Amino acid sequence: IINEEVLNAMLKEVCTALLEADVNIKLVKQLRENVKSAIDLEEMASLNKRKMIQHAVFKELVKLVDPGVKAWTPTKGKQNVIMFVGLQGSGKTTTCSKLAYYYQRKGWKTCLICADTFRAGAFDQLKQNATKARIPFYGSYTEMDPVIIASEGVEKFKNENFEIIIVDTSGRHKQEDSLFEEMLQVANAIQPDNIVYVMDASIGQACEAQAKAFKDKVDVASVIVTKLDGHAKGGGALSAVAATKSPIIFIGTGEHIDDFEPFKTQPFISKLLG
């Protein structure tokens, strides 16, 4: 009896923390029965209950962030095309320059393509970013067909033999079929080696539905969770990984170009957990 109450006590505490880290409530309820299956109060000899339970919780979170697919990597000498997709405001344009700068300081020939023909200032923004970081950019103040821009950009930087060709696209949401089709046309056009779904860490329960639809329309292969600076929890990332069948590769930790680091699981989960 005492053991049951203890277990229901820690578990209620874990589950309330997880929901307020913006984990999908279905995920939280599933983990709860997953930790219950994996724990037997009766076998525990006199040892400490909490520590085994905390481990059991933490071990089940680790399964959730691991998609069991190894993250994709660029290959030296070949033309690597990387495409950015994500919801409106998710951080795509800023992250494009962050990823380019990451690779450029690691010795890669990187460029940027602004193929956002909708957002006011979309080229200016990417242009200014790229210029401050000494990274080649390509776009147009006049062209309105983003498939043309992304095609002309990708080929141009290939004829100049770049290694990292990063295409920035417009923000779009799942219930806008014309945007989700335009996104399909850009991907088919440039044939990217790696599509990055970008998600704002402050996203709530809507994450699984959006992220799933991005993966249903286009072969999302990677995830970058932005705005994890400081205090953000980012529990939507679990829905994102499960929905897009992709690993989280980096995290964005601020507005500046160097606020960018490769994703590591345990510290992310520790912050998530407590």
Partner 1 sequence: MGSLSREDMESVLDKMRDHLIAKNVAADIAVQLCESVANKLEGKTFSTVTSTVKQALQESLVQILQPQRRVDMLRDIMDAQRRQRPYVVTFCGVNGVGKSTNLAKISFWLLENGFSVLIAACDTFRAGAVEQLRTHTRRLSALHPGGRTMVQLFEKGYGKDAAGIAMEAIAFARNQGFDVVLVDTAGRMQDNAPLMTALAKLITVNTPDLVLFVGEALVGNEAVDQLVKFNRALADHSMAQTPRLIDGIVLTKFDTIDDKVGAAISMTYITSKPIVFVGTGQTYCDLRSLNAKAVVAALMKA
Ligand X SMILES: Nc1nc2c(ncn2[C@@H]2O[C@H](COP(=O)(O)OP(=O)(O)NP(=O)(O)O)[C@@H](O)[C@H]2O)c(=O)[nH]1
Query: Residue with structure tokens 């992250």?
Result: 95
- Give the integer Cα–Cα distance in Å for 102 and 135: 11
User: Nearer to Mg ion by C-beta: 35 or 195?
Assistant: 195
Beta-carbon contacts of residue 40 (< 8 Å; ≥ 6 apart): none
Q: Residues within the annotated binding site for GTP?
A: 86-93, 168-172, 226-229
Phi, psi for 42 (deg, rounded to 5) = -70, -35
Whether 97 contacts 133, CB under 8 Å: yes
Q: For strands 248-252 and 260-262, give the pairing.
A: antiparallel
Among positions 202, 245, 259, 265, the unique one binding partner 1 when judged by CB under 8 A: 202
Q: How far apart are CA 105 and CA 91, in angstroms?
A: 21
Query: Cα(162)–Cα(154) distance, rounded to whole angstroms?
Result: 9
Among ligand X, Mg ion, partner 1, none, the one that 140 touches (CB under a kind-dependent 5 to 8 A) is: none
Amino acid type, 26: K
Tell me, residue by residue from 110 to 129, as one string, x for binding to partner 1 by CB under 8 A and - for no binding.
--------xxxxx-xxx-xx
Per CB under 8 A, 21 contacts partner 1: yes
Comparison of 255 and 261: residue with beta carbon closer to partner 1 = 255
Q: Is 231 a residue that touches partner 1 (CB under 8 A)? A: yes
Nearer to partner 1, 51 or 134 (CB): 134
Q: Is 206 in the site for partner 1 (CB under 8 A)?
A: yes
The CB-of-99 to partner 1 minimum distance in angstroms stands at 16
- Nearest residue (CB) to partner 1, 207 versus 221: 207
**Within 13 Å of residue 167, how many CA atoms lie on the same side as its CB?**
33
Q: Could you say which of Mg ion, ligand X, partner 1, none residue 253 binds, taking C-beta under 5 to 8 angstroms by partner kind?
A: ligand X
Which listed residue (116, 163, 182, 208) binds ligand X by CB under 6 A? Answer: 116
User: Interface mask (CB under 5 A) for Mg ion, residues 88-117, using x and -?
Assistant: ----xx------------------------
Q: Classify 5 in phi/psi space as left (phi over 0), alpha (psi -120 to 50) or beta.
A: alpha
- Which of these segments, 30-38, 87-95, 101-109, 180-188, binds ligand X (CB under 6 A)? 87-95
Output b/e per residue, 104-119; b: 16+ Cβ within 10 A: beeeebbbbbbbbbeb
- Measured CA to CA, the distance from residue 226 to residue 171 in angstroms comes to 14
271 binds partner 1 (CB under 8 A): no
Identify the residue among 252, 268, 269, 272 touching ligand X (CB under 6 A): 252
Q: In the complex, which residues of this chain contact Mg ion (CB under 5 A)?
A: 92-93
Q: In the complex, which residues of this chain contact ligand X (CB under 6 A)?
A: 86, 88-94, 116, 119, 170-171, 173, 226-227, 229, 252-255, 259
